[PDB]
């Protein structure tokens, strides 16, 4: 059953918003992190609430 519930619902998961890889340059005390996506510049962006 784990298989067939997964195959049918898999098509809706594969319309992904994608993902990126950065690297922590430095943090700040607003809970935000400066990370660099390598080809482009750097971005200050916040963590999800859970981590």
Cα–Cα distance between 19 and 13 in angstroms, integer? 13
Q: Taking the complex as a whole, how short is the minimal distance between the CB of residue 28 and another protein, in angstroms?
A: 9
Tell me which residues touch another protein (CB under 8 A): 1, 3-4, 6-8, 10-11, 13-21, 30, 38-39
Give yes or no for a contact between 34 and 25, defined as CB atoms under 8 angstroms apart: yes
Q: How far is CA 37 from CA 13, 14, 26, in A?
A: 24, 23, 14
Q: Taking the complex as a whole, how short is the minimal distance between the CB of residue 47 and another protein, in angstroms?
A: 14
CB nearer another protein, residue 1 or residue 48? 1
């Amino acid at each position: 059953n784990d298989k067939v519930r997964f195959i049918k619902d898999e098509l809706r998961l594969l319309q992904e918003p994608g993902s990126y890889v950065g690297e922590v340059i430095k943090i700040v005390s607003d809970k935000k992190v400066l990370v660099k996506v390598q080809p482009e510049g750097k971005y200050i962006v916040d963590v999800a609430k859970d981590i």
